[PDB]
């Protein structure tokens, strides 16, 4: 949160509701994908997907 960086996008105004709501939509998507990828990778080998693959014979 650098003053100059904030000012380039919002010019001394607080973030408006419309932008907050719009930003919440994007966050929801990116965050979920990020968490899911981290979680599945952390448990690699234990998941059904990994076990189903192992059963190739």
């Amino acid at each position: 949160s650098f003053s100059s960086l904030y000012k380039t996008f919002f010019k001394r105004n607080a973030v408006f509701v419309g932008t907050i709501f719009a930003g919440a939509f994007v966050f929801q998507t990116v965050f979920d994908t990020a968490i899911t990828s981290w979680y599945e990778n952390h448990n690699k080998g234990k998941l059904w997907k990994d076990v189903k693959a192992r059963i190739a014979a």
Binding site: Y39, H42, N43, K46, L47, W48, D50, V51, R54
Partner: protein, 50 residues
């Protein structure tokens, strides 16, 4: 309460699903079903599992 009455304390094994970030080991679940079917099922029901 005597030790016998209470029962021996069960020690802590390192289950791979222990811990906030850990899922179950699904290969172990699969194998466990086989043990249930071939051994436990003769006397034990699993009524709430569809």
């Amino acid at each position: 309460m005597t030790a016998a009455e209470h029962g021996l304390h069960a020690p802590a094994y390192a289950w791979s699903h222990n811990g906030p970030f850990e899922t179950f080991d699904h290969a172990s679940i699969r194998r466990g079903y086989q043990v249930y079917r071939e051994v436990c099922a003769a006397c034990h029901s699993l009524d709430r599992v569809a």
